[PDB]
Design a protein around this nucleic acid. Sequence first.
RNA 1: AGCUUUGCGCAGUGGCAGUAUCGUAGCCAAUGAGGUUUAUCCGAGGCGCGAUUUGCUAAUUGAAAACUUCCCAAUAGCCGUGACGACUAGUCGGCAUUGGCAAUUUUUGACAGUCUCGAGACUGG
Lengths: 45, 96, 106, 48, 48, 100
Amino acid sequence: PTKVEAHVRAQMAKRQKAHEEANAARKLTAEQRKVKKIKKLKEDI
Amino acid sequence: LTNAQRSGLNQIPNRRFTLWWSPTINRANVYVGFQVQLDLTGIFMHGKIPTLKISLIQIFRAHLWQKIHESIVMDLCQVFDQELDALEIETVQKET
Amino acid sequence: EDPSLLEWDADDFRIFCGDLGNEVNDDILARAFSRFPSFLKAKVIRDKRTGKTKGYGFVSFKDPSDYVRAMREMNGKYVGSRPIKLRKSMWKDRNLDVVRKKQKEK
Amino acid sequence: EEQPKQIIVTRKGMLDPLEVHLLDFPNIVIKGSELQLPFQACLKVEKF
Amino acid sequence: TEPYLSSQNYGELFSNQIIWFVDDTNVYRVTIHKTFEGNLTTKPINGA
Amino acid sequence: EEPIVNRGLAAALLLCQNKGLLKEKDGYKPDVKIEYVDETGRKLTPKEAFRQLSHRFHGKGSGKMKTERRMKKLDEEALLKKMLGTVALLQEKQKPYIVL
RNA sequence: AGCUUUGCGCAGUGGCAGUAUCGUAGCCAAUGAGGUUUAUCCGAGGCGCGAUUUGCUAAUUGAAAACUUCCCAAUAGCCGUGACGACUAGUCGGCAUUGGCAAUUUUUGACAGUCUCGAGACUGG
């Protein structure tokens, strides 16, 4: 019984890994947070 | 389902009734003969009983009459090959 | 391994049409799909020693964008005298069912 | 390989639904039992 | 209707043909719990 | 409960019975056996004996997919009847209730 | 810089799914739907009609369940016998097929079980 849900364990690891991939890209890497915090704080004086 | 399909679904028990009482309805005393032999089947149908024609065609569909005759012929020759020498038979011949 | 599957492939996609009228359609199918996607190759499976059509036929299209519109529009469309039924081609040959058997045990 | 081909119901009111729900498996045999086996004793052991 | 599993037919349980027993008695079970002043509850518990 | 007793046969019969594994004519008994078999020697179901008869009658057998299903079905019977408890015991001894 | 709220979108774990989820082009609806509780109070959708994609796999009937078969003929150890051949009526080698190959020296089984520290003992009542 360990073999079939070991396959599906590798596949759900693939699935959770793909969720973490789609969160890994589109992440505001290190400075896109900085430019969006800037465009939040720097108004249109 | 449609009104015509409900009609046909209620005529289904007439089909099983006609097929049930077929040996005494489809005889020659009951309907004087205009004996139409059923196609690819050895049944004669005294009287146009179209419900019985549909039921007996659906029984003998896909050449069941010829398959019955072929199976009986080949099983009988299987019997005659099983009992060849002890009836003093040289061989059998399934005729063409 | 029949030596006739190699006349359509250019990595192109094949639509499978079946339920076709065996009295006709030898080139009627080509005629009907011809407007879509420029001169192409569309066969009909007419078996030998008989000259009778086995039903099904394979129309190979240049695009899988072309394919979706063709499939959706000509599904059940009156062609010769029977409405065509459309599915995707199998081509389960040796080099893919060996891979399928290797994917079975994994 | 691990599916059974003979299934024995202890309580007699289950073989008739088992006939219905196992028509995908006509290879299996659904018989009743004259001997009933106390599997509520399995409930009585603390682990189960 | 198959011969029910008697005490003279149970010897067929142990040949090579794989056999299952389905005891469905303990599936739906309850506990009936009183407090004296007020009312009385019945808690459906898990079964097997 | 019966052991196959060494120097003894009858205990094996009491085991297998418990397990339920059991014109001037010629003048003679013609034991007609009418039997339907495939090429492998298996005793044939009358539905599939009629199917073999009708394949030979119509001259057109099954397709490829139904022959795949039928052949894989026959070796499913062959693989089944030629025989996870030890794997369950080894998985339980690794840690008792293997919940699926 | 970190925390965090709200709304929306994406994916994931789980749960639910015919008193559930929606469509509404027909009408009505914050210019108030719908209100028996608390009514000089509450505040959101309501009534009807109409619904409940796609891929994979299994199983059944059926002749056939849709991806480019059956049948006939022949070929693929020894003791005897027949010729051919070789060596002196006898012997030997190869070839061929017109009978046989479970009764002590072989190929149709004196084997099987037990016990003791590579070696022996016991039983087959």
